[PDB]
């Protein structure tokens with residue numbers, strides 16, 4: 001509500017700075033570099049869906065920050081959708097338990113939260129100013145991680161991948177031509193991308209001093225101890241960066 005407004009706005013400004021530190025660009029600039037696209041106060045309708053609407057309030061906060069004219073509809077679901085279109089929304093933003101989408105009504109473009117999150121976090125990791133090599137470790141090759149790994153291959157990085165499910169590791173190896181990472185033969189990285197719903201997924205063996213860990217993952221892949229010891233540059237934010245990615249991907 002009131003101090004939460006300050007709280008979300010703080011967390012976004014922090015993340016923006018962490019992104020500036022690592023890449024030289026802010027989140028706005030990353031999206032501009034990623035999609036060749038820019039905010040022009042487009043009207044975005046945030047429609048709550050049945051699946052107390054605090055998530056939509058966060059999205060309102062987040063979209064305001066990036067220079068969009070956003071609103072939350074009074075009605076939820078289909079009534080909400082209708083209210084949004086009728087009130088001049090150019091982009092619809094909405095989520096249920098399994099899908100979070102942004103739909104641009106002007107141009108027909110639609111984004112899914114998961115690939116957009118994976119692409120932007122991978123992009124941020126790839127742009128690490130003080131990285132020594134083009135080698136990158138991706139841990140987690142699910143709905144967020146696989147598209148992030150794909151983005152990294154297309155930017156001609158040498159991508160190593162690991163997933164706890166051999167099945168998903170196999171898929172990525174075949175589809176993307178990434179190198180399977182073996183914990184029995186680790187290697188140090190200066191660039192790490194992690195898309196896992198688990199903590200302590202990044203072993204100490206893999207870390208180098210002043211590496212970037214870029215992770216949308218909840219909770220955090222590295223312990224506070226290890227990120228202190230290695231002075232790990234941490235890119236992690238729970239909703240805003242992914243949301244910006246979506247919005248900018250559809251403009």
Ligand SMILES: NC(=O)c1ccc[n+]([C@@H]2O[C@H](COP(=O)([O-])OP(=O)(O)OC[C@H]3O[C@@H](n4cnc5c(N)ncnc54)[C@H](O)[C@@H]3O)[C@@H](O)[C@H]2O)c1
Pocket residue numbers: 113114117139140141142143144145162163164165168195196197198201215216217218219237238239240241242243
């Ligand atoms: N911060 C954001 O803005 C944002 C946006 C979208 C998703 N997320 C988060 O990103 C995370 C991943 O989302 P997703 O859709 O890719 O999940 P997913 O379930 O589709 O895939 C996650 C992958 O991580 C793998 N994994 C789990 N534990 C592992 C371990 N110990 N070592 C290696 N791999 C492991 C799983 O096998 C799975 O393939 C989730 O925690 C999700 O909440 C964050």
Ligand SMILES: [Mg+2]
Pocket residue numbers: 216237238239240241242243
């Ligand atoms: Mg995010």
Ligand code: NA
Pocket residue numbers: 194195196197198199201215216217218219220221
């Ligand atoms: Na994680």
